[PDB]
Every structure is written in C-alpha cells, then in structure tokens.
C-alpha cells in the first residue's frame, strides 16, 4: 500500500492500477532469498535530458546478495518489479515513458559490422545516459530510433507505462522472466532493458530548479539459480 | 475473418532466400573450387533477405519448421551442341557439421548430411525441423554467446539454421553449363513471441541492429503546417 | 526536416482562441500514420476496413486548463476551416483541466477527400499557471478497434 516491506527494505508508494504485468504473465517459478528493493542512484531529469537505459540483471550486478549470487552461480532466472518514481510538485509538467524492452539489442554509433563493447552493453547501476556523447565502442544514443533503428513512437508495443507529472508520478512494471531458454547466464546476457525516456520535456515554473529526480527501485522476484555448486557429487 | 493476419500466414510464405550459381566443368588444374563455382555452400540466413528480416524482427522470438524448395535451371552461353541432362546434389549441412571446401570432398558422401539429388529444370523440396538450440530463434540477442570475452553482442550460434551446399553430380562435357539455383524457404508451424517495434531505418549488418549514419529521416514532412490536413 | 521526439509533441500555445491545434486526414498508409505500428502493418496488406482508436494525452501542468474541441470529419466531407464548423459537426469539447487523456473511436470506414479528417480547435485559450509561460504539449495515439480486419497481403520494398 504505502509501507511495502520486502526483506529489510521498505518503500513508500502509490498505486491503484499502477502495476503493469508484462504480457499479462505474472513471474513464477519453473521470493524470500534475494527479494528486496534495490534502490538505484536517482537520476537528475533536467530540461535537456534525453533518457536513461538500464540493463537487467546488469543493473543489479553489485547489489548485495543478488549481485553476489549473480556471479557465484552461472545460470539464473529472475523476474522483476520495477518502480520508477519521479517525485514532483503540482507545478511541473512533462511526461516520461518508462518502457521495458525484452532483448534490447543496441546499435553501435559507427555502423556496419561494428559491435558495441562489453563496457557499454553492461553499464551497471549507472545505466546508459542517452543525453551524453557517443564514445568509441559504445551504442548509438539517438533516442528517436530507440538505440536499435526502430522509432520511438512504436516503443509502446513493449510493456510500458507513462509518468505524466500532471496525473501521476510513479510507474510500476512487473517483469517476468522472458527468454527462449529456461535458464541462462545472468552475467553475459541481459533479459530486459528498462528505459526511462522524457517524451514531453520537463517544464518548471519560474522560481523552480530546472531539474527533477527520478528514482528507480528494482525488486527481483521469483529469482532462481542453478542447482550446481550445491548439488552433491556423492 | 482475420486469417491472413495470423503469424502462421504472415510469416509463413515461400520467399526467395538464396540465389546461387554453380557451373559444370572439369577440375583439371582448378585451384579454388568456389572462384570456379564448382560448388557453393550457403549458411542458411533468413535475415539476408531484408523483406523477411523486417517481418521476422517484428517479434523477439520465432520458432518454425523450415521448408526448402530448390529450383535449378541451366544455361549454356557458349558453343554447346546440346543441352546436357544434369543432376544437382543439394546437400543440407546441419548445425555443427562441417561444410565442404572442395566439390569432391568427403562431406558430399557423408551420410549424416542429408542431400537431395534432383534434375536441373526440375525442382527439389524437403523440410528441416526446428534446428535451433533454444526453444525459439532469437531475432535479437541482448548479450554475448558462450563466453565471458568479446563475442560481438548478438552474434550467437543459437540461431544456426544449418547450411545448404550445392554441386553438380555430373562430370564435365566439352562445354560449360551454368546452373542457377534458387532456394525458396517457407517457414512452417510458425509461432512468435514478444512483438517489437517495426524497423524504420535500413540495415548495415546481419545479426546487428546497426543503422547507417547520416541516413534519411523516416518520418516524412508535411507539405504544410501541423494544421494542414 | 529531421526525426526527433518533438515530432510526437503537438504544441499548444497560450492566448490563442478559435485557432486550430492540429489537423490530419485519416489515410493510415500515408502521412502521420505511415510510421506508426498500425500503419506499418496496414501497409503490409492492401485492404484494411476497420474502426480506429484515437487517443490524446495532455502533458502540461496540473493547474493549466483549456477546452479543445476535437472534430471528426467523415470521408467525403470537407475538414472544417473555423472552430464553429467543427462544433456543428461531430466533436468532443474536451476540457484539458479535467480530463487529461481522451479516447475517441473513429467510426468504421473501409478507407482504401477520403478516409476522413480529424482536427482539433481551441474552444478556449490555454490558461497557464502563474509565471509558467511557454508551450505545453499533447501526445496523440492511434490503434485499431477489435473489429479491424486486414486482407490481401502485399510487399513493401525498402
């Protein structure tokens, strides 16, 4: 409701139909182990922001017991509950598109057979700042083509949710495990990518700071790992 | 009422995925058996055809049995005195099997590579099941394959559909005969998951979402203002 | 002349009454709809013949308010050229202050001038909150109603 406690973590939130369960499939086994809220560093949505992109499970790779079990076990299988909250007054306008893209293969900014380096396809808690400059070996950051050559308007076929600061300030997207294999290596392959894209730009009133924090809180749910490293050899 | 919009029917139609050209001539003093076009192998790549690539990449995953129709037609643009009656071996190399390097290799008589022997002018037809390693093919792969090192980000061997190799079983005549082979793939028992955005920009690579630089805007401009109908 | 996020944003302006906000025809194979998910899959086939689901979304501040009047001109007719002709036809007077998202079902067409028009006019001027001046934006959405058919599949080239 407003004191959702998951593990030793607790967040305060608002919902009436806020959870977007992706493709109407709740995450389920093929909690109570690594299921807690991991609250990423708040991004600053300024007036000239282009967007942010976090890879999952790569955004949670240093996050405590989850990131420990991610590198301890080879194979894993996790769903997610992603809360994106952009707290504001009733004077801010603007609109975020919080979208979850399964298998978001990125495009390099050099074209041809040039591929994106592991430094940039796995950026961690920092994510990809889409308003920054293209670095050598990084992805293309042109937000109109969704970093993959497909237009930004057609990004609503993926499980998405708007944060219209006029209407709400939170977006919850309940991600299941989406892959073509039943279990996979969590360290070399990103299942989904969370993107938070300002479509309508942030307008502040005169007398307000032209910036606004965005908090992403990812709770991994129904997280499984491989039976090896605890399976007996007898 | 909407049976044309099924993915069994939208993705399931015979497109031209490969057109190769092999020749019937002697290998006497022939070094390279590909520059001579004595044979041609082709890694089965449905994303080589950008009309079928743009339809397959409307989905994240796709699982289909395959269906290959092979049309071989001859041609003799030299002095010939007769049109020869030729037989083509259309050999399906499965995923993980070795490809031919010569037209008289051991691979052509390998029993585990299924091969079709058919006449030129006639047509071949066979079906290959789902030979992927995942439970579906990956139109898009956000990550690396099999390795912790650099593995090209989306280039994965899970999407290996096999290989088709083509030679003429016949020996040479005194004239050169040019057989052009057209492979027609039809995805059957198609099922697809996670619909994606349609691709607006053209392609630069296979297996990569890279679009060309300084390309043209896909959203086309009005002839007036936003109020102009 | 380039593709950008600003092309999805329908600009609204203060101190404009009885002007037009936007206006488009409803050929969903050309124009604004050619690159949408509807119009990329419509242009794989030849004949569509269904109802459309047209939405708008007001993204300006919670204190701003305006009345926009959302005219549907059916096919065969002329699109309106003042706010009053829009009101005398099929419309919604949509109060931006109250309803932040409007959903309008375009009637069954078989549209393949023609296909219909769709315009938006300022009923009232845009009232902005104090010392918050400039432009606010609309986001427009298109989809298909579940009676939408699609037949005689064809091939786009490049």
């Amino acid at each position: 409701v407003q004191q959702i406690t998951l593990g030793n973590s607790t967040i305060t939130t608002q919902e009436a139909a806020n959870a977007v369960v992706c493709y109407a499939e709740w995450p389920e086994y093929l909690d109570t182990s690594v299921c807690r809220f991991y609250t990423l560093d708040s991004k600053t949505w300024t007036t000239g922001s282009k967007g942010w992109c976090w890879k999952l499970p790569d955004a949670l790779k240093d996050m405590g017991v989850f990131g420990q079990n991610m590198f301890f076990h080879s194979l894993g299988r996790s769903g997610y509950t992603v809360h994106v909250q952009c707290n504001a007054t009733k004077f801010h306008s603007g609109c975020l598109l919080v979208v979850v893209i399964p298998e978001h293969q990125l495009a390099s900014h050099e074209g041809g057979n040039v591929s994106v380096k592991y430094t940039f396809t796995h950026p961690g808690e920092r994510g990809i700042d889409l308003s920054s400059a293209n670095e050598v070996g990084g992805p293309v950051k042109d937000v109109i083509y969704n970093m993959n050559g497909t237009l930004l308007g057609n990004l609503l076929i993926f499980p998405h949710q708007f944060i219209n600061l006029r209407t709400n300030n939170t977006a919850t997207i309940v991600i299941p495990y989406i892959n073509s294999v039943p279990i996979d290596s969590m360290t070399r392959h990103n299942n989904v990518s969370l993107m938070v894209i300002p479509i309508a730009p942030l307008t502040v009133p005169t007398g307000a700071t032209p910036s606004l924090p965005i908090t992403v809180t990812i709770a991994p749910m129904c997280t499984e790992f491989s039976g090896i490293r605890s399976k007996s050899i007898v | 009422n909407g049976s044309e919009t099924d993915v069994e029917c939208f993705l399931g139609r015979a497109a031209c995925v490969h057109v190769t050209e092999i020749q019937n001539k002697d290998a006497t003093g022939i070094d390279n058996h590909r520059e001579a076009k004595l044979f041609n192998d082709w890694k089965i790549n449905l994303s080589s055809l950008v009309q079928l690539r743009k339809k397959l990449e409307l989905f994240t995953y796709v699982r289909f049995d395959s269906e290959y129709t092979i049309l071989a037609t001859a041609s003799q643009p030299d002095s010939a005195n007769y049109s020869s009656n030729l037989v083509v071996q259309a050999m399906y190399v499965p995923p993980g099997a070795p490809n031919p390097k010569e037209w008289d290799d051991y691979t052509w008589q390998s029993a585990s590579n299924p091969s079709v022997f058919f006449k030129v002018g006639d047509t071949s037809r066979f079906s290959v099941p789902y030979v992927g390693l995942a439970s579906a093919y990956n139109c898009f792969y956000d990550g690396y394959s099999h390795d912790d090192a650099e593995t090209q980000y989306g280039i994965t061997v899970l999407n290996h559909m096999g290989s088709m190799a083509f030679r003429i079983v016949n020996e040479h005549d005194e004239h050169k005969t040019l057989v052009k082979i057209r492979v027609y793939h039809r995805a059957k028992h198609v099922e697809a998951w996670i619909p994606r955005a349609p691709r607006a920009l053209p392609y630069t690579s296979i297996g990569r979402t890279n679009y060309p630089k300084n390309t043209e805007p896909v959203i086309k401009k009005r002839k007036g203002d936003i109020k102009s109908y | 002349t380039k593709d950008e996020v600003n092309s999805y944003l329908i600009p609204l302006n203060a101190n404009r009454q009885n002007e037009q906000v936007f206006g488009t025809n409803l050929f969903i194979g050309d124009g604004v709809f050619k690159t949408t998910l509807l119009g990329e899959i419509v242009q794989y086939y030849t004949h569509w013949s269904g109802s459309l689901r047209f939405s708008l979304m007001y993204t300006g501040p919670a204190l701003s308010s305006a009345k926009l009047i959302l005219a549907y001109t059916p096919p065969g007719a002329r699109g309106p050229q003042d706010r009053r002709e829009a009101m005398l036809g099929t419309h919604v007077v949509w109060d931006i202050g109250l309803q932040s998202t409007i959903v309008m079902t375009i009637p069954w067409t078989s549209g393949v001038t023609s296909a219909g028009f769709l315009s938006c006019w300022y009923q009232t001027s845009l009232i902005l909150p104090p010392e918050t001046t400039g432009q606010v934006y609309l986001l427009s959405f298109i989809s298909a109603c579940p009676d939408f058919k699609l037949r005689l599949m064809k091939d786009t080239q490049t």
Partner: antibody
C-alpha cells in the same frame, strides 16, 4: 503565392496615429496569423506583435499601450496602429505569415519616418 | 520575458571561412528558435527554424545547432551571397524577442 504587401503613409508627425496596413494575397487571415516586426536604420530588428489566426493579439512588453493590431478577414487586410509617436519609430515595418508559428514570407516593408 | 543576447556583434571573414553565430537566452526556449538573414535594404529571410531545421530555399552550408538556452548557427564554406546581419528570434512564450545581431564583413 504567399505575399504580404505593406502599405503606409510614411510621413507622419509625432503624437499622432499610424494606419500602416498589409494586404494579404495568397492565403486567408482565418487560417494563419500575421507577425509585425520593425527595424530602425542602424539598429536591429524588433518584434512589434502578432495577431493570431483567429482574433487574439500579442504585443511587446513595452508596447502594449502604444501598439494595437486588428484585421479584416474578408478584405484580407492587417492593421497596425500606434499612439504617442516618437523619433524612435522611424523604421521599416514588416508583415509575415506564421509558418509553424515562426515568421516568414516577409514583404519588402514600408519605411515610415516620423518627422516634424 | 526571455531576453536573447546574440554574441558577437560583427565578424570579419573571407568567403570559405567558418562562421558560428551564437544566441543565448535567459529562459529556456526548448528549441523553439528561428534564425534570420537580412541584406542591406532587403527583407529578412528565414534560414533555420526549430534551432536545427533548415527552412525552404536554404542551402546546406547553414547548420543550426544547440539546445536549451545556447544555440549556435554554424555556417561552413561561406559564399559571396552569405554576407549580412543575422538575428535570432525565439517563438516560445509571447513576446517573441530578437537578438542583437551578427553582421558579416570581408577581411
């Protein structure tokens, strides 16, 4: 063709009014608005105001009191009037069409000098 | 009000040099800027609208850039026709104020 022919008396004593008009040939004032921009010689361009495509007008912050803009929709004429004229009003006055709410199709402009 | 400060005031360059006029606003224009070109005794003509989009009848030598408050007008490989006074105008919040102006002269 979209053309906006400026027309003014151009010889006006100060502390008087202005009847400097723009006949609109090519488009309609009900579907587009007209922006007014003056430029004194030596100094740069200065916005005066814009009557919108249906009635509404905007002005300079310093010239809300002096300037006033109306239009005739049938005769396609746009009217600019100013009160309490000074020597700083010696300027070529221009009309425009509002293209994407910007300003273009500027006429050649009538140089209107306020003199004794 | 949004006040445009167009720096510099005048530039001396040859036909082929790169000219980068600059406008910086007090408020945030949100890329709703228009650049103008004017000759001696001629009407101003529109070069760049929306701070990046070249207008109709504008060559590809002109290139609008910049976002937010600061906006550059980079002109590459000048010709003989491209000498004159250049004025910004923002079209965001009514009033639509101009900038100061950059004139081009030959070295």
């Amino acid at each position: 063709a979209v053309q906006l022919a400026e027309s003014g008396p151009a010889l006006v004593a100060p502390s008087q009014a202005l009847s400097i008009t723009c006949t609109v040939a090519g488009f309609s004032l009900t579907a587009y608005g007209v922006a007014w921009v003056r430029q004194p010689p030596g100094a740069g361009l200065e916005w005066l105001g814009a009557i919108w495509a249906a009635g509404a007008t905007d002005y300079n912050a310093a010239l809300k009191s002096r300037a006033s803009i109306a239009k005739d929709n049938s005769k396609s004429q746009v009217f600019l009037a100013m009160a309490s004229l000074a020597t700083a009003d010696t300027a070529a006055y221009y009309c425009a069409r509002e293209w994407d709410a910007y300003g273009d199709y500027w006429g050649q402009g009538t140089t209107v000098t306020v003199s004794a | 009000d949004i006040v445009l400060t167009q720096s510099p005031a005048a530039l001396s360059a040859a036909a082929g040099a790169t000219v980068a006029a600059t406008c910086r606003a007090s408020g945030n224009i949100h890329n709703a800027l228009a650049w103008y070109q004017q000759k001696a005794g001629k009407s101003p003509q529109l070069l760049v609208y929306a701070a990046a989009a070249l207008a109709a009848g504008v060559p590809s030598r002109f290139s609008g850039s910049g976002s937010g408050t600061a906006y550059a007008l980079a002109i590459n490989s000048l010709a003989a026709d491209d000498f004159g006074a250049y004025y910004c105008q923002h079209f965001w919040s009514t009033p639509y104020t101009f900038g100061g102006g950059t004139k081009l002269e030959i070295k």
